Amino acid sequence: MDPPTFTFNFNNEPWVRGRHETYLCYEVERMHNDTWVLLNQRRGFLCNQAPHKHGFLEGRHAELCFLDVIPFWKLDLDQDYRVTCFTSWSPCFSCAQEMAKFISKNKHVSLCIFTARIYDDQGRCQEGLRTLAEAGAKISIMTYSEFKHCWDTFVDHQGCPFQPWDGLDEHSQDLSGRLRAILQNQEN
Ligand SMILES: [Zn+2]
């Protein structure tokens, strides 16, 4: 892990050059009712690009890979599991359907996804976002404070301190307004 490894992916603001880049960072934790074990010491990353070794990209979603990663770890249903995924983009329609059904098959795992920015892939898909909030695990806008936590865990700040600002958080407040509308329509 490099000190700016997390900042590099988040510093993709300029990536708007006509190329599509996806960066996903996630962590896994084991929790027991008697005690809680934090495997934060280890971490991993997922990309939405298909494997280069087979040749040209064949098609792989970064968010979809994480959902398949849980079942690959053969997690125990009798043991509590807490998994968090850090991503900054909207999920593909195929991922929305899998995210809702996935939790239905595993409600014993606490899954939380933070999106720095949310863009609607298509219109009339507002219903998918509402369902995604209910079954698409818990989703919230990443705040600078939350970013600081990922900064220490994903990168060894030892010797390399991160200086956070309330600039990105200001944009999140406006984004929360649009997202609030989706949650505001939460019919009782
Ligand atoms: Zn997908």
Expressed in angstroms and rounded, the spacing between residue 162 Cα and the centre of ligand 1 is 31
26 Cα: distance to centroid of ligand 1 (angstroms): 16
160 is annotated as contributing to ligand binding: no
Report which residue type is found at 171. H
Is 112 annotated in a binding site? The answer is no
Q: Please, what is the Cα angle at 20 between 160 and 151, to 5 degrees?
A: 20
Bridge partners (DSSP) listed for residue 110: 82
By what technique were these coordinates determined?
NMR
Ligand 1 center from residue 175 Cα (angstroms): 22
Burial 41-63 (b: 16+ CB within 10 A, else e): eebeebebeeeeeeeeeeeebbb
Measuring CA to CA, which residue among 123, 128, 118, 124 is closest to residue 95? 128
Query: ∠ CA 86-116-182 to the nearest 5 degrees?
Result: 110
Cα–ligand 1 centroid distance for 94 (angstroms): 5
63 is catalytic: yes
Catalytic residue among 29, 58, 63, 170: 63
The closest alpha carbon to 155, from 88, 89, 86, 90, belongs to 86
Q: Tell whether residue 85 is among the known ligand binding residues.
A: no
Burial class (CB in 10 A: 0-12, 13-18, 19+), 115: buried
